[PDB]
Amino acid sequence: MEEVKKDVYSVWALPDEESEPRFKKLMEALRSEFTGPRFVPHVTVAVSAYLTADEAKKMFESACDGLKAYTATVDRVSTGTFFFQCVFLLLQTTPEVMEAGEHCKNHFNCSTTTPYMPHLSLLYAELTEEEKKNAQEKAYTLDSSLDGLSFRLNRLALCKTDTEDKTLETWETVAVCNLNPGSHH
Numbered sequence: 001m002e003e004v005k006k007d008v009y010s011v012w013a014l015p016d017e018e019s020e021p022r023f024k025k026l027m028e029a030l031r032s033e034f035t036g037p038r039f040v041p042h043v044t045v046a047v048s049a050y051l052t053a054d055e056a057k058k059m060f061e062s063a064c065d066g067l068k069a070y071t072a073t074v075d076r077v078s079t080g081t082f083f084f085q086c087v088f089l090l091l092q093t094t095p096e097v098m099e100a101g102e103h104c105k106n107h108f109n110c111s112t113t114t115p116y117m118p119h120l121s122l123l124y125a126e127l128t129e130e131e132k133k134n135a136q137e138k139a140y141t142l143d144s145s146l147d148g149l150s151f152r153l154n155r156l157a158l159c160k161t162d163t164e165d166k167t168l169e170t171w172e173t174v175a176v177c178n179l180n181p182g183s184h185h
Contacts, residue, residue: 006050010161011063012042013100013153014176015120026142027122030087034135036125037168043072043091043120043153046104047111047163059107060158060175067103067156068181070096072118074149077139079132083166086125087135089149091118100153124166155179 015023023041031038045067051059075092079085091097101116123135140146155178162170 003052003054006052007056007160008162009048009051009056009060009174010044010159010163011046011048011060011103012040012157012159013045013067014155014157015041015043016152016154019151022143023120026139026146029142030123030135030139033138034123034125034127034131036086036123037166039121039124039168039171041120042157043100043118045100045116046106047161049109049111051109056158057175059109060156060177063103063106064156064177064179066106067100067179068096069153069155069179070100071150071152072097072120074120074146074151077122077136077146078119079136083124083126084121086127086132087122087139089120089122089146091120093118124168153179 020041027041028038048056048059073092073094074089076090077087078090079087097118098116101118104110104116122139125135127135155176157176158174160170160172160174165171
């Protein structure tokens with residue numbers, strides 16, 4: 001009754017200032033032959049519900065006060081079946097990561113039931129299976145170390161995101177926090 005605007009936010013686990021461009025080159029690249037909206041290298045651990053202004057920060061506030069940094073291994077390059085699961089770095093369900101998913105359930109607002117699939121999406125583009133094969137096919141001519149690939153999730157970002165906005169124009173970054181745990185010295 002005081003705060004009256006509620007929006008859907010998605011929490012993004014960011015890469016490394018040593019990973020990102022290794023990625024960004026692959027992204028800005030795959031996006032020329034085949035195409036679409038070039039975004040930021042990211043792994044998504046959660047998607048919220050209608051959270052007001054405060055109730056969102058306080059919530060990212062809490063999340064950031066957690067989700068210790070961790071690492072991912074690129075199990076493989078794969079293709080999905082819709083504009084958002086086009087080409088993506090399918091990741092391995094190693095412990096620490098599938099648990100970054102316990103984040104979507106982390107405390108109170110979920111979006112209750114989906115089988116969390118960790119991946120670093122490469123491209124969004126409603127393609128034809130054959131060009132899909134190629135996008136993937138072709139992806140492996142830019143990165144050969146790509147497979148077996150492991151990386152660190154240095155931080156987070158809270159983003160106002162409209163999950164169906166293929167134009168990604170409604171996606172906007174509201175905040176980010178760095179997470180470099182190590183604990184005891």
